[PDB]
Amino acid sequence: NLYFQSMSVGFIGAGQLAFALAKGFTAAGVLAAHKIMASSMDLATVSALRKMGVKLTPHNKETVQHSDVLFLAVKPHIIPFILDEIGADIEDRHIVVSCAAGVTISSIEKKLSAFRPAPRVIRCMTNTPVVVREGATVYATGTHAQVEDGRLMEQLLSSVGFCTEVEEDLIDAVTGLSGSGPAYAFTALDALADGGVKMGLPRRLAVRLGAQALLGAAKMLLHSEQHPGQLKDNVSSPGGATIHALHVLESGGFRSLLINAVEASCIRTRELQS
Amino acid sequence: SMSVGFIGAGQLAFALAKGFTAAGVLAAHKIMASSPDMDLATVSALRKMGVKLTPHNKETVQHSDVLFLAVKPHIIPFILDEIGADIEDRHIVVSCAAGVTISSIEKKLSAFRPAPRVIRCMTNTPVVVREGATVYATGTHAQVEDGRLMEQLLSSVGFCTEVEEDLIDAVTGLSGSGPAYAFTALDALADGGVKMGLPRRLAVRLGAQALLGAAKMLLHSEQHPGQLKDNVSSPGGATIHALHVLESGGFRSLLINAVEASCIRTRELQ
Amino acid sequence: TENLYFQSMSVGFIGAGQLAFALAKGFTAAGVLAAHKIMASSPDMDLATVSALRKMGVKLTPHNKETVQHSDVLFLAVKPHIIPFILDEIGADIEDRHIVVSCAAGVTISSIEKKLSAFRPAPRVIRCMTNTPVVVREGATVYATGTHAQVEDGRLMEQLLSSVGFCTEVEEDLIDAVTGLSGSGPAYAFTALDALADGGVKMGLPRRLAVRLGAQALLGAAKMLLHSEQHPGQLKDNVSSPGGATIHALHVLESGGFRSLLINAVEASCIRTRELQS
Amino acid sequence: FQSMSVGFIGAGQLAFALAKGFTAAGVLAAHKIMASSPDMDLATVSALRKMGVKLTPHNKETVQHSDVLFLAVKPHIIPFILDEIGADIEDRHIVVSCAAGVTISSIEKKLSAFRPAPRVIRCMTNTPVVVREGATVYATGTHAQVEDGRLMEQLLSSVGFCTEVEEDLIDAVTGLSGSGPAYAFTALDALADGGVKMGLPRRLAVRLGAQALLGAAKMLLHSEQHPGQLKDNVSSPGGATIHALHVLESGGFRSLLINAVEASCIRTRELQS
Amino acid sequence: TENLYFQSMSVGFIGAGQLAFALAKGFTAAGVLAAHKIMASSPDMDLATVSALRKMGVKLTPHNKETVQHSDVLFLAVKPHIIPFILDEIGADIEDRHIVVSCAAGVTISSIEKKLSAFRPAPRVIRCMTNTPVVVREGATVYATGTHAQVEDGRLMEQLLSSVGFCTEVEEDLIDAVTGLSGSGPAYAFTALDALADGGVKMGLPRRLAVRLGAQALLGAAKMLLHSEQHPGQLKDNVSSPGGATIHALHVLESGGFRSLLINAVEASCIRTRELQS
């Protein structure tokens, strides 16, 4: 029955992330949709937000004056433009939460400190499954963030999934793992379904079964105290179908591809910083 | 009022007994399990839960109303010969064995009594957290009420739907073997997290959460998985770079290979 | 045809190669321009493309200056390394009325404006990236407007180029990526159609039928996607029946990394375009 | 011709695509089409329903409704269908099998048990009939009249390219234009991913890639040139395109498409067996 | 030209496709036959190859029987699966004088003699494997003589076919392998020349020049080897200077298994020919 009585939230950016978080927060019951405002405007996401009850506006300054907690849900290269546009509208009360991949706390604070000293900044990396309250979020607190700010951020983002504080220099690696992770899974689920269809399953059933399989396996591991290799061993019977299929995954270097992916996403994130 | 029996007391019977009791569909002590090996760790875990154990398959048959066969495919004909004479009118015999056809079971049971009620099912271990993926097919003598009971039971521990029996070998290669594909994926994702500087514990937690959230997102969405992939991939961004490296390794083809190989091996077992 | 006609517009082409013939043929076929309001100039007035233009009734000249004096809208349809020589040649002949439309891959608006501003301030420059299928009115074109382009200039250029295909304005820093996708795209398709026909022939079809069927398949699929609200993967799903022929063939494409090769190609063309840009 | 009624045994994606195309071409009214399926819970059945197509669970009703009867079920179901409604075939019927792999001979053999001289046509078409740009071939059976072939060609030409072929080409056509649109949808998704990787919005990338393919295909159809000559025509020396063509060649791109046509054709021959 | 002239020889072609035009064009160019002593027949008397034959002055007819009655040497220039239908059609029209020269890939002398012997004993049959470059008098041909071929028949056929290229007698059981090497060889070369030209274009050559240079290189190298007493690897050594451009490029061919692909191709064509033979 958590509810943030005094909190007004703003989103600068009204895209996939802003929609997902607002949907997750209101689904959780921690915020009413009308205490949320977003800015952008003929966008698909912006049409959905209006249905939820989220206030909307084409003016980033209005989002800023509305908001206590202010999410910057824009692309990495737009962040500097945003900070210069509303930097003079930042007030003591604002917590500026940057969601942009790769953009450092140091740089946001540099840009905002030209307007007022000690802006309160948090960097976060979340993902779209917050829209079903199963996101994966990490955050790091900035130089002038108050101790209550990180706790407030964690209580809010925990309502829509996993959330934990990390040192900032981990966030690029988290981006390559849980930020890009859902995309890896959507690709895997499409391919698994193609597999089921090749072997004679109707597409709709193959998609449902593959997604249920992944969901159940992920929950099993989250609820288990066991190594994922131990769960693999437990479900593989001698001579059986599963160990045969695991061999063909191994023969294509399946494991190395996923390592390559996490690495490539992390490295590109570091390039976006620079 | 219904009582459940397991012939076989391995990972599947544990997982199903744990899920059924967790769902509250029946009490641990209304379940009975028999195994040739009373020293397996799954048997000791069943004991802890409060499930009744016996070495005698006949005891399980006479205890049970719904009787699951959770033994290895090549054991099924020996089990059917052992307790065929003890099947009664009331029994619904649910074979969980990969590859084994309703026809072959009905033929062996029919030697002892006409009209055995047989259901064939393919499920997976995540029933242990009530998120299994189950399909079933009803046999010649299975009443319509039998399929409904079966679906209501297996829905308490995850997704459950009736299929034509000729789909079950392919289901085996997708959701039967699927969790093992995911556990492999999760170990490798965590290795990638660790390579890039994350502590192992956090990397495992984030990868598992990413997969759980993605799967739930897809189940709750009306969108194609490629559309979701498109929605979360920004231009020039980190995710589309990493998807390119998956593509360059033929990632999709490996998962197709896996489903095919597990399905083909399942067909070899019958 | 297109229910447009630019009655007061003289169009000039510097360069009389494949692209100039493709655009002139598309414009005249669309009815938006009469071939005699078009003039083209070429250093090789013997190219096969020059013979066809003459047949169409396009005016031809060996003198780039004569094309400039004739035209209002001036298409620079030359190779990227030649744009600087052309601008030095006719830069003093640009007048207030001229809209200079550079078609050269990679050449930035910045660089054209810099070379032209040596002769006259405020040249009106547009950068476009189009492709040869404008010759059958199914081109794909993007454009970006320069510093001194008037608002009406980009609107006029979009009207003209939409008569021969898809056309939209983009930020200039997207054009290198577009070059890699729709600029080089037809060549990817011609390679694919040749290979698909070889496959049809291997399995016993006459070559003519195989080329016809393969091209019709690609045309129909592309039209289906354009007219659909669906994701290409949904359409892929919709047409792959369980256990069937199509899903078996899709598996062999996946085993070869088919998707990754197409991503590689867009990337390689885009990166090469950026190298020409420097 | 004005009284012609069409039936589909099968209410899947092909039945929908053909019904959509036929009615878009104004060939006949949606209510002059009847489709049957064992599963009425299909989305394509919902699509057909909203179109105005009459729907039934009874193949016999579809047979009695129709004059031109399309068989648009999976290859392994055809023999059960033929046994089920073979006694309901009448002299007016033209039976058009769309099933992959299934031979005219085998259809005539099953139907001949019920009535001499069944009029059978085999065709291979594809989903783009839904936008009237299908690729269709057909072969006429033993008892098909010359009029039947002409009617067949007029009907399937209203929704795209259509030509008569020897039956022994149809398996290969299946691997080329039957499966072709799926190869293109895969290619278009990948091309879009490449455009997005290089900084384009997804929506624009899909649009540009589809337009590129549509235009290239139309150019080739309208050209008297070899596709390799058109490739040469648009490949400038040292340029972006020839660099990208090299990376396609380095991956064996051409051989993958050959492999795909071959694999689809071979599978089609297995479905027959 | 060739200082031969078969003044009493009437030649017939059943089939009027690429191979019939290639041979007729080579024979008449060599001067060994006048186009009017040649007759060709085709089921499609509208093929482009039929238009050219008519231009040459070759007699044309839709009736295979009329070609048979006209000719002394009778070339069967049809697809392997059609040879049996042709032999059933004209078998009763074969006379003592006829030499039946089958060009079809894979079809054995045995099978032709069996089908023809149903009508007349002792048909004179020759099996040959040639290629399209006979059209420029640089074909590569082998032949094997049948059971009832007279000694003079194989000598006559070698005289005729040597006027348009290399020609030699082989045991019939070598012809499938020859098909894989010189029968399919020109197609390997056309593929190689297209790829080499693409390479020249990538590195900045105009396409026309690149095709010209690549073809001249291949022609010159093949002529060097034919006129040399040396092993091709010795010639490779002789032209690769230490540390130089050529040896660097040879390394990248080796890294791709270039040699193994060419071996694979000969093998695949030979094995396919054997499958057609069955």
Ligand SMILES: [Cl-]
């Ligand atoms: Cl995401």
Ligand SMILES: [Cl-]
């Ligand atoms: Cl499992």
Ligand SMILES: [Cl-]
């Ligand atoms: Cl082009």
Ligand SMILES: [Cl-]
């Ligand atoms: Cl299709």
Ligand SMILES: [Cl-]
């Ligand atoms: Cl040849």
